[PDB]
């Protein structure tokens, strides 16, 4: 029950700040885990940019923060091909930062003859790369997804993501992901714990979401701690830790 803690997975919109301000008791929640020497690694399941790009909005807020602080289901599901297939000649649908990502892990993008269609929160999507990505599809490739959120919230309130390109491709190929490694997929925090060290006995998501959030904890078999900053009162289903926002999660060690 808390305290044995060493690392924590941080969300980042809903938990840590929201609507590009940062939230009340944010900073003063890093502190106390320098203090009381603890590690900590946001995540994000958002691959319309890469984790560097993250880096830079934080500290642009206000948060001088290292390079592997931040991660994003870009970079997992990129180690995760080069775990196990090695670099790969994709078909991106994905965005000019997430295709970096790509390309820092060997990777290669092959619009012609690719053995891989990966999908991300393509934010550059038009109905061309939908088109090719389809076909290619029906030719059999191996079909991989960044994460499987279907909307993403946002200033103009929830807005088409991966899921909701995913129901395109669904529905004209009959064809769904062979593999989705974002939350709540275990993989993120198995790759966290490896990248870092710290092993599963020690390690606990903090977040806001309530489904996933909650279940990714549940799966990859970690402590999960909902803070209320989000969209969350209505509950059922699996429960976890809670608390307000980082005040009370500070004040808790
Ligand atoms: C009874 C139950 O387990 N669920 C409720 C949820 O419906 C309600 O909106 C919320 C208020 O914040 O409290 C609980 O989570």
Redesign the pocket.
Known sequence: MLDKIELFILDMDGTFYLDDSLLPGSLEFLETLKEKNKRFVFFTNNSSLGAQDYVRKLRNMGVDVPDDAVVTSGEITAEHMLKRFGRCRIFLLGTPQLKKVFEAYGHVIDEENPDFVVLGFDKTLTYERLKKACILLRKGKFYIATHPDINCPSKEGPVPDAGSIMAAIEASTGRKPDLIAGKPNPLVVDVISEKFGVPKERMAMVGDRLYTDVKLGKNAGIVSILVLTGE?????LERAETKPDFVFKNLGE
């Open positions: 969350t009162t209505p509950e059922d």
